[PDB]
Amino acid sequence: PTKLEVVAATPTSLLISWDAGHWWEWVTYYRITYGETGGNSPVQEFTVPGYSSTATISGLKPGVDYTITVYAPTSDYGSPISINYRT
């Protein structure tokens, strides 16, 4: 995928989106992972089906800089898309 944008943000949550491509590029699922940019504990993650281009990340510590990575099913597509964002 491409264009990992934080569409919206409350102090405790980020609404993100990406460009799913078109037709012959839509995969069956994307995998979103989010964690404190430079943490020590397990990162967080979930997965959305391929038809959706957005995803909601919730339950974040307010004022902390998190990094979000949206992953493709395999590596044979368009490389991981990652961004940083402080709540």
Binding site: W23, W26, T28, G50, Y51, T74
Partner: protein
């Protein structure tokens, strides 16, 4: 009529067989949906056909339609070798299918 159902199931056979390789590890959405829809449709029509048709004839004619369509679409869409041997094998397959439908 059950024979019409059988031929249509044999068609969906090749459609999902080729969309399965166009889909990667069941990862591309459009080809994966095409494969799943084709599998469900094909197996359903095959069952409805075997209800009134013998299993030994229905299975092999379904397999023959599938492999014949696979070779048709491979020679046409993949620039596969159109061997004279493959032509006569297609003749054997089609004659078998039609002769099986004739003796019903």
């Amino acid at each position: 009529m059950a024979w019409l159902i059988l031929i249509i199931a044999g068609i969906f056979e090749v459609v999902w067989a080729i969309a399965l390789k166009y889909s990667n590890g069941f990862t591309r959405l459009i080809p994966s949906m095409i494969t799943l829809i084709g599998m469900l449709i094909s197996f359903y029509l095959l069952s409805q056909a075997t209800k009134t048709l013998p299993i030994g004839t229905a299975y092999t004619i379904w397999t023959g339609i599938g492999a014949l369509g696979a070779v048709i679409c491979g020679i046409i869409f993949f620039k596969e070798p159109l061997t004279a041997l493959r032509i006569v094998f297609m003749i054997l397959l089609l004659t078998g299918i039609i002769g099986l439908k004739a003796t019903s």
